[PDB]
Ligand binder design. Structure first.
Ligand SMILES: Cc1nc(C(=O)N[C@@H](CC(=O)O)c2ccc(Br)cc2)c2cc[nH]c2n1
Length: 167
């Protein structure tokens, strides 16, 4: 039993809710919140910009130190950093950005990072400003993640389409 409330169960291990991931994180304080990161951990917009704003820029400060030490992530890769006031940990995961020409096949590799964590709150990788089809992102998630994932979908119209079209 966990504290996530109001989610629709899609499969044995995947759940979904029309919600703002920032407000969901602040309420639940999950062990892991997933960020829709880029390889530079520049959290300027989308989910990343919103999550970073909620930490009063502390996420960006920590991220800049991480990059100065380690260099950029790989597309499809991840790193674990602090969750600040939102969660114990933040798993920064880099899905492919279609608006940069990146291979959509890397979306499966991106979701594989979730399997290193028993329970996560997450957005649909490569959705929103990353330019991929959210229906596809959801299919890859369900077919790749085996741990317990709670998906927060900001847009109500998109959430209804994702539910109504789910096989
Ligand atoms: C769960 C959650 N999702 C986002 C978000 O940016 N969602 C994108 C998708 C994406 O970026 O993955 C989207 C927004 C509108 C339309 Br129409 C289509 C896609 C934010 C932003 C602040 N809080 C958030 N909480």
């Amino acid at each position: 039993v966990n504290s996530f409330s109001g989610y629709l169960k899609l499969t044995d291990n995947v759940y979904i809710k029309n919600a703002d991931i920032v407000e969901e994180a602040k309420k639940v304080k999950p062990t892991v919140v997933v960020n829709a990161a880029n390889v530079y951990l520049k959290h300027g917009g989308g989910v990343a910009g919103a999550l970073n704003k909620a930490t009063n820029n502390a996420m960006q400060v920590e991220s800049d130190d991480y990059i100065a030490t380690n260099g950029p992530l790989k597309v499809g890769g991840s790193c674990v950093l602090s969750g600040h006031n939102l969660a114990k940990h933040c798993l920064h995961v880099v899905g492919p950005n279609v608006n940069k020409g990146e291979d959509i096949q890397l979306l499966k590799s991106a979701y594989e990072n979730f399997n290193q964590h028993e329970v996560l709150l997450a957005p649909l990788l490569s959705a929103g400003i990353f330019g991929a089809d959210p229906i596809h992102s959801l299919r890859v998630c369900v077919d790749t993640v085996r741990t317990n994932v709670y998906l927060a979908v900001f847009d109500k119209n998109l959430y209804d389409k994702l539910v109504s079209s789910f096989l």
